[PDB]
């Protein structure tokens, strides 16, 4: 038992679901940037 | 695509004067360029047995399913012939229908690029021989022909000479061109499984022969100033290319699985949804979905699709053919005559 | 134009649809996600295609 | 079986030579680019010369080949069939921390002396050895990382 | 940029939470290389080897291809003589589409039993890191190649004086792509399929 | 359930489908974006040019039918009792044509505005334009070529 | 500098292939040896001009013509790349033009002043720096009047009539270098701290030799601001001035301007990844557009002794 | 067991890695901002063949502070080792690292904006190297603390 | 054990490697913050040196400021430490590295500004060295804490 | 034990390392932002130097605030104290520490403007001044719940 | 016991901490920035010197709302304190300190612009302070909530 909260399944969908939050956030940055410079 | 370019040649002469428009002299200036396109991708499409998604059930399968089975099991048909042309009509629908096909056009690309590469390449045998240069022959092509013939005619052989040899019967494992190339070069002796006997006295020896050539292919032309540097820029710009354009006739399997996969589904989410026995309903939602399957398959498949295929096999005449043969520019005929030309310049 | 060249290739679509869901061709009533009765969804574009026929000669007047 | 060697070893064994080579070519690539940005602001149009001109881009290939030879010498000791303690995973971690911010910080200073440097031993040829004396220092940042790389390779 | 000193004291409170209670061989991150699935590291190697390689290989694309686009208002001759630096950029992504080939035969199905064995992990962490390692050299070698191709489009302007010297570091740009394929191939060399 | 298909294996599969959707309708996005700002400010003078200088956003649209195909492709091999290898191979395929579909849907985006600003001034620039819009593109279809060749291996 | 190219990658290589349109010093040789502005105008179009007289007769070439119709080819250049960027660009492209309204808010009050006509005066006024409140400037002749009347609208309002152009201008261009400062990145920081001083430079000189306080008229913001700005405050002669000059390691022997300007010009080409090369590009052009009408006065009236005082670097 | 773990010999690795990462960052700063100053204005005159190296060879004095320690800790370095010796030789990499860091820092900034004034006058160079050795001093200072951390990775660890 | 753990000596090792780690980013930024406002003096600077060298030899101090106590924690660093020594010897460390820090940043940005106004008018020096003993009495409260706290590490512990 | 555990020096040591640090940090801000305006003005009049240092001299009295109660705090740590003791150590050490800080970052933003304008008028002297005690006794009002609060600490 | 844990003095300490820092730096910034147009105002007209005292003087009072609370949250501090009482004693001075610093934020940004306008009109007596009684009620009700939560701190604690 890795704990009974933070199990391993919960910690790899949450970093698989972190992985696609930042490059969600970056991706969301570049258009931001087209709204931000024109 | 052929009743695109066929009506164009069918009446040239009335389009030979038109209004002209912006695609539509593009359009037409290449009639013949879309013309045996359309043929030789029925050609290929019924090689491929490909009609719009689907499959032409016209010879007699190779793959003979069993006899007797329940409802919702799977089921491997065994071999009792080959398909006389094209592909088995019986790889449709199957669930390892890209396990056969994928392996099959990338070995294909593979084929059909380093064929492309060296009748190409060919080309410069035939102008260093009518310049009358025959110290280009002995320092540039006999070493470039070496060495592309051994990295990547070596690989070329072993397609087919797998193709040719039947691994169930003979009780032998079958190997692994991937893994097979990536082991003549790192680690050249201990094949993992040999594919033919005597097999790494020769496939060192090819190495060797490849790697006596680098040297050559460099010292061989200033020693027969400026052509020492032009040649070391030449060698490095041939080695390290035929290693990137047989890597990059990869295209052509890629683009082809993009298109039959793409298209398998644009059937898939317009006319097959349309089907039922409905009366009133589906009279109508057949021919509504049929106007949103045609209207989106020429839009999609057609022209954004079609650009797309059109626009590699452009790229591989470009950079994969004319790197070899085509050496040098020239300045273009371009004479003195008269032309009627417009008002509307000014 | 538009809807003759339209109808034009859907009454060749259609019906030969139509006779490969009517001969219960392998390619098109041989999963378990067919149509099933394929006599039954053939009258539906026996139907389609000549209603298409209908668009075609309907708008092959005004040529 | 080992309590030494646990079966997540081979994680920081590989993750030395992905550091290893990902950040060494991550400084071969800034020297590279960075220095051919300050020789695409020049003219020579002369033999040997030319051959002056690239010091810095065959001396940040070099730093692409300090990481290529330990990459390719902690991946040689990675095999899934035999024992691979915690110590050496953590040493061929520590293999491509070094080699990998060396080689970086090794492209970054001759890239930075480079796009400028290139502009001076060119059209102005006085100051040519003081240039490379230069880039010789700012170089070997990389095989002071290399160095310790192999102490620790043969080490763990 | 308030949130990186937000969660870096979470992290310091709850490491001395665990150290201080005697709990502090809690936050294990052997375990969790342990218990966690060799598809997740092989599949998000493999995905992030063509990921990170096309966003290099674009990223190449834009800055040289936007490049030669705007040398080429004026010198139009530009874009078919210096399409070799778009060449190199875009077999960055063949060296990605490569690794991803070949990666794929080594991801089949493993039993109930023999899933969290050595030889798993060791090709889970192998395709992970590869593809990391062929994935972010391919995005740097592209990002490398982009911006040294974008100076040959700017240069091209001029006539000859500079394009045979443009060219020898536009090629020492591809040869760090091909040694960053050839360690993720040796990386990958003795990673076995999944059994 | 059972240790080799457990309940949050499908979460990789729902996110995979939604992921492959999302990120190329961002990048299709930024590259409808930028194409059709160098269209709409391209065409307010050269207006016979409409209908060649609209290529970048239907080649950007190209990417967005490359992620819903993907798409389509997993949510078929969905389920609720899944196993967790198919649900990383969905996830897999999801930010496979996701992150190369939105950096190719970028690349198409700023080549493209270059493009038909470009090719204005300058009318022999639109056989170079396409080229390397092409190339911008088939990374987004060398993402979608990982993704059907890795969902070809689900069950 | 691999962000630059996002939104200025079309235009910084549409600008570096205009200034290979400057035309070279081979290419003021075989235009010096004219003697008519026909035969100039012949051998202007095999440049990247390319034959922008073509709707002109030749029978009337006048030697403004040439030098309005070079120029109007220079601001339909700048104001093509200047509806092209982005918000890091687009404003350091106007505040290119902000101090071009400056010097024409300087000559419509020294032209209003006198009696003279508001169409004539505008004729000369430079069309770059132009805000629709400008045509005007008659409603006073007050300096305090003019900036709550007409320049409370205009972006010249966060900064006699050449008392009140130096309070606009080194108000300008202390706003104009510490926004270079903050918005622009690395690779055009040095530039745009070097080239503006030096503008900040050979305008505070231009002040003490007009002159034959002073300390609040003057811009600080180049070289010249915490040593020379004291030293040259407190000069009433010309020697004063010019032992000022010579603390200066860049500037002693000078008092030659836009030689140094170009010299310092040629330069700033030499960094490509910089938004400092569209500033290079305009005082380039802006220079051989006056080395062209310096060329056709020498021309027009036969004047061959003074002709080779043109001047290019690149 | 509990004073020798098993992931004793990280602490140790990183400190290892630490010194060369710090130490060359610190010897790429003051190589990259001192090569830059030295030539920015001194293109005229061209007797300066060894005018200016003097920053650059004492930014790798930096680096050979961290290639001493890091090899000497390599040393200490075992399979069966504990936690004291993998935290005291962590402060003997941290040390090093760091301080080098902040001394090749302080020798950038000197180099870089000191390099200029000299082309006008050659009597910079009696005070430019004596402000300048007091930055590497603090380099000095880091690995006498680690040189000394070192000394005692043995003595009585059991 | 419980009053003497195995992560006992993870405290004392990152506070004796935190006083010279700090303290000498205190010294480079008092250092090459200094040291560039005397490099750019040059007319003056042969005539007056050995009088604005003060604000580098003030800094410098500070550096063996953090020295003179890292040594001096790093004697009493052991195995088998009380966890309180660990405490209180990093909190020596911070305490003379972070002040230490303070003083350097006082010193490098009251020193540069001095050397201006030096090259101006010579009677500034009494003024400037006024301020920048202020600056540097500022690290030595850090010092005279750190070894207070250092000289009870070791009193009656268990 | 429970009330008096092993940990509970942590708090008291960095109360009495924070103490020191954060105030001298604020004395450091509060010499820095004056000291760069005295000797940036005294090359105007040289005779008024000795009534500039009033900013400085306030600051270096706060980082005395700062060590009276720092040396007061380790008067009392020991090995084993309670974990109310360790508390209201660092509550301490934080209230003259970061009050302290904000002190001289008030002293250091007002001192600076009062030496630049003080070259104008002499009477000003009395007027900026009086401004800078109110936001120095902000530095004895965290000296007063610094030392009210440590006094407590050992009851119990 | 639960009720009564021996964790709960830290959040009672928080607040008693939070108090005299969270207002301080409101009165910091209610001090600097009000009094830094001291000289704009004084090198025209010295007459409004007694006017710049006023928001100085409103931020006193607002330095010493939070010192009232630390010091009678320190006078309900204890070892073996309820849990309950350390989160009202948290709650307590948190909202004083908070709302302090919004007191000190406004009246240090109004008193700036009241006072750079004031040389301009005598007659802004009333208008200025009238606008700064406001503002300084802001932390007077942070204040009358930090005492009832006070008053109910010990209360009925078990």
Redesign the interface.
């Known amino acids: 038992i890795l704990s009974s909260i933070w199990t391993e399944g919960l910690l790899m969908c949450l970093i698989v679901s972190a992985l696609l939050l930042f490059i969600l956030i970056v991706a969301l940055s570049w258009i931001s940037n087209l709204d931000i410079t024109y | 695509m052929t009743l695109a370019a066929l009506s164009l040649v069918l009446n040239e002469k009335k389009i030979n004067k038109m209004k002209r428009g912006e695609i539509f002299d593009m359009a037409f200036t290449g009639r013949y360029i879309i013309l045996l396109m359309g043929v030789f991708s029925m050609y290929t499409g019924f090689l491929y047995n490909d009609i719009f998604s689907k499959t032409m059930t016209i010879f007699k399968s190779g793959w003979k399913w069993p006899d007797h089975w329940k409802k919702g099991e799977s089921i491997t048909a065994t071999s009792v012939g080959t398909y006389p042309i094209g592909l088995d009509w019986a790889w449709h629908g199957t669930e390892n229908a890209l396990l056969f096909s994928n392996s099959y056009k990338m070995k294909l690309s593979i084929l059909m690029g380093f064929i492309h590469m060296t009748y190409s390449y060919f080309f410069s045998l035939a102008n260093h021989l009518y310049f009358n240069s025959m110290i280009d022959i002995i320092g540039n092509f006999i070493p470039g022909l070496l060495f592309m013939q051994g990295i990547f005619g070596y690989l070329s052989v072993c397609i087919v000479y797998k193709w040719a040899v039947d691994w169930v019967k003979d009780g032998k494992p079958a190997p692994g061109l991937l893994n097979m190339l990536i082991n003549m070069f790192l680690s050249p002796g201990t094949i993992d499984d040999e594919l033919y006997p005597h097999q790494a006295k020769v496939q060192v020896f090819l190495l060797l022969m490849a790697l006596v050539c680098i040297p050559w292919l460099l010292l061989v032309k200033p020693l027969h100033g400026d052509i020492m540097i032009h040649q070391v820029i030449h060698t490095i710009e041939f080695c390290l290319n035929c290693v990137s354009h047989t890597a990059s006739y990869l295209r052509l399997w890629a683009l082809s699985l993009a298109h039959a996969q793409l298209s398998s589904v644009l059937w898939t989410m317009t006319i097959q949804i349309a089907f039922g026995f409905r009366g009133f309903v589906g009279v109508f939602m057949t021919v509504a979905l049929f106007a949103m399957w045609f209207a989106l398959t020429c839009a999609v498949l057609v022209l954004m699709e079609g650009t797309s295929a059109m626009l590699h096999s452009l790229r591989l005449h470009w950079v994969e053919s004319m790197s070899k043969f085509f050496v040098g520019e020239g300045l273009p005929y371009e004479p003195f005559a008269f032309e009627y030309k417009d008002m509307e310049v000014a | 134009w538009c809807c003759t060249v ?1 109808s034009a ?2 009454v060749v ?2 019906s030969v649809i139509a006779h490969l869901f009517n001969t219960n ?3 098109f009533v ?3 996600n067919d ?3 394929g006599p ?2 053939a009258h ?2 026996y ?2 295609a000549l ?2 026929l209908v668009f075609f000669v309907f708008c092959g007047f005004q040529v | 079986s080992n309590i030494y060697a646990p079966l997540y070893a081979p994680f920081f064994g590989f993750a030395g030579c992905a550091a290893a080579m990902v950040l060494s070519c991550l400084g071969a690539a800034i020297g590279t680019a960075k220095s051919g940005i300050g020789i695409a602001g020049i003219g020579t149009f002369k033999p040997e010369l030319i051959m002056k001109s690239l010091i810095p881009v065959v001396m940040s290939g070099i730093l692409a080949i300090y990481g290529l030879v330990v990459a390719v010498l902690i991946a040689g000791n990675l095999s899934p069939t035999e024992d691979y303690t915690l110590f050496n995973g953590f040493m061929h971690l520590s293999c491509g921390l070094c080699v990998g911010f060396a080689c970086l910080s090794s492209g970054y200073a001759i890239g930075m002396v480079g796009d400028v440097g290139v502009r001076k031993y060119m059209h102005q040829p006085r100051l040519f050895v003081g240039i490379v004396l230069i880039l010789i220092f700012s170089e070997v940042l990389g095989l002071y990382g290399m160095i310790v790389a192999l102490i620790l390779n043969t080490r763990g | 940029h308030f949130l990186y000193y937000l969660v870096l004291i979470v992290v310091i409170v709850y490491g001395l939470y665990k150290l201080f209670t005697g709990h502090g061989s809690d936050i294990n991150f052997g375990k969790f290389l342990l218990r966690t699935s060799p598809y997740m590291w092989a599949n998000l190697g493999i995905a992030l080897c063509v990921g990170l390689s096309v966003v290099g290989a674009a990223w190449g694309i834009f800055i040289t291809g936007s490049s030669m686009i705007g040398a080429g208002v004026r010198a139009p001759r530009i874009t078919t003589k210096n399409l070799i630096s778009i060449i190199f950029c875009e077999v960055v992504a063949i060296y990605g589409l490569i690794i991803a080939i070949v990666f794929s035969s080594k991801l089949t199905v493993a039993t109930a039993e023999n899933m969290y064995s050595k030889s798993n992990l060791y090709t889970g962490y192998s395709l992970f890191w590869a593809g990391i390692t062929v994935g972010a050299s391919n995005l740097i070698c592209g990002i490398a190649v982009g911006i040294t191709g974008a100076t040959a489009a700017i240069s091209d302007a001029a006539d000859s004086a500079l394009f045979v010297k443009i060219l020898v570091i536009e090629i020492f740009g591809s040869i760090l792509g091909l040694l960053g394929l050839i360690v993720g191939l040796l990386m990958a060399g003795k990673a076995s399929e999944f059994q | 359930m059972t240790e080799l298909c457990p309940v949050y294996a499908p979460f990789f599969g729902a996110i995979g489908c939604a992921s492959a959707i999302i990120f190329t309708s961002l990048g299709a996005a930024y590259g409808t974006a930028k194409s059709g700002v160098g269209i709409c400010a391209t065409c307010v003078l050269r207006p016979d040019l409409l209908f060649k200088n609209i290529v970048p956003v239907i080649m950007a649209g190209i990417i967005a039918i490359y992620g819903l195909v993907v798409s389509v492709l997993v949510c078929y091999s969905l389920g609720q009792k899944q196993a967790l290898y198919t649900g990383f191979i969905q996830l897999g395929a999801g930010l496979s044509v996701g992150l190369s579909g939105l950096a190719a849907g970028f690349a198409i985006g700023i080549v493209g505005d270059a493009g038909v600003r470009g090719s204005s001034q300058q009318p022999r620039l639109f056989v170079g334009m396409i080229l390397i819009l092409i190339f911008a593109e088939v990374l987004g279809l060398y993402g979608l070529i990982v993704a059907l060749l890795l969902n070809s291996r689900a069950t | 500098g691999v962000y630059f190219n996002i939104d200025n990658g079309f235009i910084e290589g549409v600008v570096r292939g205009y200034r290979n349109g400057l035309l070279s010093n081979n290419q003021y040789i075989n235009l010096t040896q004219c003697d008519t502005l026909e035969d100039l105008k012949l051998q202007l179009s095999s440049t990247d001009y390319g034959n922008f007289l073509s709707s002109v007769s030749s029978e009337s070439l006048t030697t403004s013509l040439i030098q309005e119709y070079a120029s109007s080819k220079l601001y339909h250049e700048f104001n093509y790349i200047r509806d092209q960027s982005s918000g890091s660009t687009r404003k350091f492209m106007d505040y290119i033009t902000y101090g071009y309204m400056i010097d024409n808010v300087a000559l419509m009050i020294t032209g209003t002043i006198h009696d003279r006509d508001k169409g004539e005066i505008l004729q000369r006024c430079h069309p770059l720096g132009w805000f629709d409140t400008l045509p005007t400037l008659s409603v006073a002749t007050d300096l305090e009047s003019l900036y709550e009347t007409v320049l409370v609208d205009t972006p010249l309002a966060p900064y006699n009539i050449e008392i009140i152009r130096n309070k606009l201008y080194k108000a300008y261009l202390e706003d104009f270098y510490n926004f270079v400062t903050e918005e622009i990145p690395e690779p055009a920081k040095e530039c745009m701290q070097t080239l503006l001083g030096f503008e900040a430079d050979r305008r505070s000189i231009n002040i003490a030799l007009n002159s034959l306080l002073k300390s609040d008229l003057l811009p600080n913001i180049g070289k010249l601001y915490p040593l020379a700005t004291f030293h040259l405050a407190q000069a009433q002669d010309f020697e004063g001035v010019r032992a000022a000059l010579a603390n200066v390691y860049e500037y002693r022997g000078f008092l030659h301007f836009y030689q140094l300007e170009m010299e310092l010009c040629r330069d700033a080409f030499t960094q490509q990844f910089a938004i400092s090369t569209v500033w290079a590009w305009m005082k380039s052009k802006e220079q051989e557009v006056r080395n062209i009408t310096w060329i056709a006065e020498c021309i027009a009236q036969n004047q061959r002794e003074r002709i080779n005082n043109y001047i290019s670097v690149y």
């Open positions: 339209l290739f859907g679509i259609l061709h392998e390619s041989g999963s378990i149509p099933e009765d039954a969804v539906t574009v139907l389609a209603v298409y």
